[PDB]
Amino acid sequence: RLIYTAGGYFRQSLSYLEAYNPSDGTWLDLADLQVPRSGLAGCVVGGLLYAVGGRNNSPDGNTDSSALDCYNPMTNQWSPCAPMSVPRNRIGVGVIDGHIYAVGGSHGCIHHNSVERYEPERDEWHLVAPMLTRRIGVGVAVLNRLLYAVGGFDGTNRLNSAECYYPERNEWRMITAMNTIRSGAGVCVLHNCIYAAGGYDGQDQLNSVERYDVETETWTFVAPMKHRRSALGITVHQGRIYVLGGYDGHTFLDSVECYDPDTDTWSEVTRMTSGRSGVGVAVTLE
Amino acid sequence: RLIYTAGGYFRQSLSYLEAYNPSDGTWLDLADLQVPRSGLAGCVVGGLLYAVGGRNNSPDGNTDSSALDCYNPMTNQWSPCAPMSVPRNRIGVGVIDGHIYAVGGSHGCIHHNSVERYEPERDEWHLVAPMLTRRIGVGVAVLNRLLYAVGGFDGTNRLNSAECYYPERNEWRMITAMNTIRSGAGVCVLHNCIYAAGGYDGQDQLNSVERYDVETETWTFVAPMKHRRSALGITVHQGRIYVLGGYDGHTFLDSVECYDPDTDTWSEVTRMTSGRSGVGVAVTLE
Amino acid sequence: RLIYTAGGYFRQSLSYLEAYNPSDGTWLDLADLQVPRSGLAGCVVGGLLYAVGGRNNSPDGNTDSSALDCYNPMTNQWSPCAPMSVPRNRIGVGVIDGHIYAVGGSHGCIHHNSVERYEPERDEWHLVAPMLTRRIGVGVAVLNRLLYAVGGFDGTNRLNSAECYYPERNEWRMITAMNTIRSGAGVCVLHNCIYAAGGYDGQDQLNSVERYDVETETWTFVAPMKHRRSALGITVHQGRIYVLGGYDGHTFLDSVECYDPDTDTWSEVTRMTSGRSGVGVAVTLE
Ligand SMILES: O=C1c2ccccc2C(=O)N1C[C@@H]1c2ccccc2CCN1C(=O)[C@@H]1CCCC[C@@H]1c1nnn[nH]1
Ligand SMILES: O=C1c2ccccc2C(=O)N1C[C@@H]1c2ccccc2CCN1C(=O)[C@@H]1CCCC[C@@H]1c1nnn[nH]1
Ligand SMILES: O=C1c2ccccc2C(=O)N1C[C@@H]1c2ccccc2CCN1C(=O)[C@@H]1CCCC[C@@H]1c1nnn[nH]1
């Protein structure tokens, strides 16, 4: 239906909200964020777009965000929701049973292993069991009612490790680590596999993509992206992964590539209006 | 039966070969290595002690070693054997079916994922399938005729990841990662479980100890060591782990702690003649 | 007109500046470099010879160079220019529109993919687009106002890959890879074709030479050199390639071969005053 892209960074933190339509390839110019921010994460619950966490990198100063803002598509306006317990810059998020999980992120020099859950019915955040590892630039994916924290950065080492959360048991456990170390990678779920595209391994931006099969418990490489990129927006729409923007250790990308799992190929389908990195993206449900 | 300690580091790379008898608590001052080195690994095959890889850190310069030297307890003599294909400083080693596996390590700035095997009868090294990850300061453990590479450092990031080698199939496979990131940890096998004691997580030296059960595929913490230590010697003697020396953030340890798995307790049983880190340790077989 | 040879290595890093006249076959002994260096690159802009990057391998210690020095033929004198942003040993250089491009190279352990441009009239360096691959011992050629980075070493593997820079667009594209892997090869342009002579493939020094046709996008072998050589000086003078010195496996070459494209034959036309490798070579324009 539509692929949102909220915020991002180019010279400073951005306030752009734009929506891409895969059918005709048009870009909608929607209402801008109240506060500019990069390193945020986007998710859609009910029929509202949620902008979680982030950081406002401006010439005047840098401020980490604990703000949850809710975009109503009908009115084309943003409405503040209950803020998180702590600011979370470079955050990952996943949705289970209509509840938003705010995973990891940073507050200045404090790297979070803590995770908290938002209940939209109550407008209320509540902390859950923390991760085994501190993760910023973490990628999150939801599969079989289980949340996966994939890769990231613990303040010293970038991570190839991943861990699975069990909502019913309220506990974390380590799974098989990735083949490549990835911080700020695009993580999503397509069919019955966890995907991890792009990222930063400590010295190079990555174009390699690998997927995790839950039953075999093995990470397998697939066709790499055309442009290597970190801090990229990722989204699945009608059986195909879409990756939007990012940073290639150099230029802020406007490129948007699409992955077809049947053919195992990447192809640039469009461009964003301007180059940016660290965007929060989410698809309109259904 | 003796616990050998070869080489090590204190202000410069050491040449010490010393042997500890756990029965009476005595120390034997044996013949020194012909070339001093730290970051080496020790192993015992067919009644002979082998010193593998390492580096000679001296005031006159630094040289990485590809040397395999063989110590005969009967003659108290070091005799050179066939050198490895490439130098391997901060190496890990394991023994399967009388063959010595040289795993990972570094040569100057090259970090090895490559692995090679030594055949004592032929005095020959041959490369096998390389690891999925480049690892230096890697811990090696042999269990059920499979070789496990644990933790380490890839040149940028310290690792909690672990992978298992299959000699018959000649292939590596990533297993469940550790709870803690460990580079230069003491890795050994006790009662059908892989132990990972100490190490360096990128910031602090560790005193925590976790073990891996092969069937459950889970890492579990046990009682921590009294002293934090990285680049530590390790071996098993009559159902108990012996850790020797290491680096705790400033002092080079001479302490030697012993782990009793029944009581789940650590106790300092003896001291080495001088403090050191990066030693090659192996026990006399049987 | 003269073929300059600056620096080089034999036992230690050299300070020689010598100039060969192809007409009468004489050698000119010009003013030595202020600082000895090998792994540098030479180029001529506006009647001035430039010595870029390199390293001073001395008995007292090894130091990588970020220095740009300018030789004035009128005064027979070297003058320091603005240094590069980072030291670059085994550097490659080319010139587009009177601007010197510093491509890749190493700073001790760091292998650069970054590229920076020097403006002689301003005496300023500015970073441009970094390469898709990190390359040390990289050969550079300019053709149709596009800069080509060929072969080299990425810190792990020696490369047969090549890539093309687009100054106006400020981006890099990966072109067709070479038939042979070449690190430290002599790269130049002749009759609208990119040549890659000699180099090191990981095991042996090479005498084979292959050229790239830009329209057909194919690498084709030509007559090989008489001597195998890596880290060789190279240039083009009156429709013929001149390769100077290098390393063949044990002996530092003083040989200077010349390639005639019409006959497709190499021939030793002269010798340098002493054998050396890793020199910077360039021709007085016109
Ligand atoms: O885009 C860049 C970038 C540009 C230039 C230099 C360094 C970086 C970088 O690390 N990135 C990625 C990084 C990143 C990584 C993972 C997830 C989100 C993001 C947001 C973008 N980003 C950034 O680093 C932001 C953009 C670059 C300025 C610094 C910004 C920042 N500083 N502290 N937090 N953010
Ligand atoms: O003992 C120290 C130490 C002391 C003081 C400062 C830093 C270190 C350190 O990293 N180590 C551990 C490190 C290490 C880690 C894993 C496995 C083997 C070893 C050998 C000892 N060691 C070292 O780093 C060596 C001892 C310290 C000087 C540098 C030496 C080295 N440098 N490159 N290779 N060796
Ligand atoms: O000439 C030799 C040589 C001689 C003996 C052993 C190894 C080499 C080698 O790699 N080379 C080539 C190498 C090279 C490769 C590409 C581009 C420039 C150069 C300069 C010369 N050179 C060298 O390696 C230099 C000469 C050999 C000593 C080491 C020198 C060095 N070390 N780190 N940087 N330079």
Side-chain angles (χ1 to χ4, degrees), chain B residues 179-202:
Chain B
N179 294 302
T180 315
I181 290 170
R182 301 179 190 276
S183 181
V187 172
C188 68
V189 152
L190 177 60
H191 303 325
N192 216 50
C193 292
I194 312 285
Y195 279 72
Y200 184 64
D201 71 348

Side-chain angles (χ1 to χ4, degrees), chain C residues 187-263:
Chain C
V187 171
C188 66
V189 97
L190 179 61
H191 300 323
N192 215 72
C193 294
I194 311 278
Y195 280 72
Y200 183 68
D201 69 346
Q203 301 197 161
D204 305 325
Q205 282 64 27
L206 300 164
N207 57 11
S208 59
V209 185
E210 58 186 306
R211 71 191 175 188
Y212 182 73
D213 187 296
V214 290
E215 292 299 329
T216 66
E217 307 179 31
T218 33
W219 290 88
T220 303
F221 283 108
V222 296
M225 298 180 294
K226 178 154 171 54
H227 301 141
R228 299 171 172 281
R229 53 181 91 205
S230 61
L232 57 139
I234 193 171
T235 198
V236 171
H237 174 265
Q238 280 172 185
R240 289 179 177 172
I241 301 166
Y242 285 79
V243 300
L244 292 81
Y247 182 70
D248 72 343
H250 32 46
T251 58
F252 296 88
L253 302 175
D254 56 12
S255 179
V256 179
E257 298 183 44
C258 179
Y259 180 72
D260 186 5
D262 296 342
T263 64

Side-chain angles (χ1 to χ4, degrees), chain B residues 117-177:
Chain B
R117 178 175 60 204
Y118 178 75
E119 295 177 314
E121 289 189 41
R122 318 190 110 271
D123 191 34
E124 271 183 340
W125 288 91
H126 290 292
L127 283 161
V128 298
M131 292 183 293
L132 299 168
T133 311
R134 292 170 187 289
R135 303 178 184 273
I136 81 174
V138 69
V140 177
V142 176
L143 183 57
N144 301 320
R145 304 170 64 187
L146 304 181
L147 187 136
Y148 292 82
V150 181
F153 180 69
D154 69 351
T156 311
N157 312 287
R158 280 81 184 180
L159 312 170
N160 67 323
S161 60
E163 50 184 304
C164 182
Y165 178 65
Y166 295 75
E168 296 295 320
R169 298 183 181 78
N170 189 34
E171 65 184 56
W172 287 84
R173 216 179 67 78
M174 195 76 72
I175 63 162
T176 307

Side-chain angles (χ1 to χ4, degrees), chain A residues 203-204 226-228 249-250, chain C residues 113 128-130 132 134 170 173:
Chain A
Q203 61 185 59
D204 296 318
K226 189 163 199 305
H227 305 148
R228 52 222 303 153
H250 183 50
Chain C
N113 60 358
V128 299
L132 299 171
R134 294 165 180 278
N170 194 29
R173 315 264 86 171

Side-chain angles (χ1 to χ4, degrees), chain B residues 109-110 134, chain C residues 109 155-156:
Chain B
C109 216
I110 297 159
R134 292 170 187 289
Chain C
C109 254
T156 309

Side-chain angles (χ1 to χ4, degrees), chain B residues 9 38-39 55 57 64 89-90 106 137 183-184 230-231 246-247 252 277-278:
Chain B
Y9 182 91
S38 57
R55 164 185 263 204
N57 291 282
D64 294 320
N89 169 232
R90 298 168 285 191
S106 57
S183 181
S230 61
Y247 181 69
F252 296 87
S277 67

Side-chain angles (χ1 to χ4, degrees), chain A residues 143-144 148 176 192-193 212-218, chain B residues 173 217:
Chain A
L143 185 59
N144 302 334
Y148 292 85
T176 306
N192 219 60
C193 290
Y212 180 74
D213 182 284
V214 288
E215 293 298 326
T216 60
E217 305 178 19
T218 33
Chain B
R173 216 179 67 78
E217 305 178 41

